[PDB]
Structure formats: C-alpha cells, structure tokens
Amino acid sequence: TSGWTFGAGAALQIPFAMQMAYRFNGIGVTQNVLYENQKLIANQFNSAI
Amino acid sequence: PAICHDGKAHFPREGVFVSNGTHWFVTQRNFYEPQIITTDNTFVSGNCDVVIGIVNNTVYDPLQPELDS
Amino acid sequence: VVIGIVNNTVYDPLQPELDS
Ligand SMILES: *[C@@H]1O[C@H](CO)[C@@H](O)[C@H](O)[C@H]1NC(C)=O
Ligand SMILES: *[C@@H]1O[C@H](CO)[C@@H](O)[C@H](O)[C@H]1NC(C)=O
Ligand SMILES: *[C@@H]1O[C@H](CO)[C@@H](O)[C@H](O)[C@H]1NC(C)=O
Ligand SMILES: *[C@@H]1O[C@H](CO)[C@@H](O)[C@H](O)[C@H]1NC(C)=O
Ligand SMILES: *[C@@H]1O[C@H](CO)[C@@H](O)[C@H](O)[C@H]1NC(C)=O
C-alpha cells in the first residue's frame, strides 16, 4: 500500500501502479515502460507467484 | 499516472502528479512542492489511450507564452 | 577528440515551433 515510505517514516499511501512505475524508474527503465504494458507485467507477476 | 494533452500522454520526469481538487500539479515525491505542469518537467511518450488512469489536463508550454515574436 | 564519431543530424525542435 505504501512501498518503502513506511520504512522511513509514516506509511504514505500510493497506487500500486505508480509504486511499480517508480520502482521501474529505479532500475533505469522509464515510467512509461510499465504503464504502456501494465497488464503484461501484472500477468507475468501473477504467473510467477 | 499521466496527463493527457492533445492526444499525447505526458509522464513526469521526476516527481508525481497531484491535484488540490481543482488544479493539477507536479511535485517531488519526498516533499510537497507544487509546480505548474510544463513540457519541461514532463516527458511525452505513447498515446492517451494505452495507460489506465489518464486524467485529461492542459500541459503548459513555456517556449511561447509571451515569446510569440 | 573522441574515437568512434558517426556523422548524423541532431534535430532542434525549437525552430519548427519558432515561426514568429
Ligand atoms: C488549487 O490551486 C490553484 C492554483 O494555486 C488555485 O487556483 C485553486 O483555487 C486551488 N484550489 C483549492 C481547492 O485549493
Ligand atoms: C479506481 O477504482 C474506482 C472504484 O473501484 C473505479 O471506479 C475507477 O475506474 C478506478 N480507476 C483506476 C484508475 O483504476
Ligand atoms: C479525454 O478526452 C477524450 C476526447 O474528448 C475523451 O475521449 C476521453 O474520454 C477523455 N478522458 C477523460 C479522463 O475525461
Ligand atoms: C572499430 O574498429 C575498426 C577497425 O576494426 C575501426 O575502423 C573503427 O574506427 C572502430 N570504431 C570504434 C567505434 O572505435
Ligand atoms: C564527417 O564529416 C567530416 C567533414 O565535415 C569528415 O571529415 C569526417 O571524416 C566525417 N566522418 C564520418 C564518420 O564520416
């Protein structure tokens, strides 16, 4: 629900799509790489689980 | 997730899109500091209909507000 | 000064907008 904001201070809510968008932005791929294919990423994560 | 200008989706270079209820702003994630949405702080990519969460909104163009010489 | 230059055009999106 809050990513890592709860590890630094009070848990700050954020949509999970935007959380994963920033986490993509943290590995060197722009945000739009996730948004343009969000469904594919969600399906891949579900299949992996 | 993004702002839909005239047929194009605008994502923020750094920071998130937020609104006070009436107006939309770009702000850095770790400290609330609104900025008017511009083509400088937002990078365009893709189309207005590929991402879920689009909110139609104008994106300011600082290159020619007054520079229409 | 750099090894591996390739000649190519780099566009300036300012001038197509700047008609006046
Ligand atoms: C939101 O911010 C804009 C720009 O500062 C202002 O014009 C508007 O009145 C504000 N609305 C609210 C709900 O505070
Ligand atoms: C968010 O959820 C609300 C209610 O569940 C829904 O009406 C809306 O379409 C959803 N928006 C997005 C961006 O998923
Ligand atoms: C944005 O504008 C387009 C064209 O008028 C429309 O099809 C779309 O539903 C609008 N979306 C929102 C978020 O209002
Ligand atoms: C790569 O090596 C070739 C010779 O095999 C040389 O002609 C060329 O300039 C080199 N290019 C770069 C990028 O260093
Ligand atoms: C690029 O053009 C210059 C002349 O303007 C020439 O001297 C140079 O060798 C060219 N380099 C390549 C990669 O063709």
Curated annotation (Swiss-Prot), chain C:
This is Spike protein S2'. It comes from the Viruses. The chain holds residues 1128 to 1147 of 1273 of the full protein. Subunit of the fusion protein that is processed upon entry into the host cell. Mediates fusion of the virion and cellular membranes by functioning as a class I viral fusion protein. Contains a viral fusion peptide that is unmasked after S2 cleavage. This cleavage can occur at the cell membrane by host TMPRSS2 or during endocytosis by host CSTL. In either case, this triggers an extensive and irreversible conformational change that leads to fusion of the viral envelope with the cellular cytoplasmic membrane, releasing viral genomic RNA into the host cell cytoplasm. It comes from Severe acute respiratory syndrome coronavirus 2 (2019-nCoV). Glycans are attached at N7.
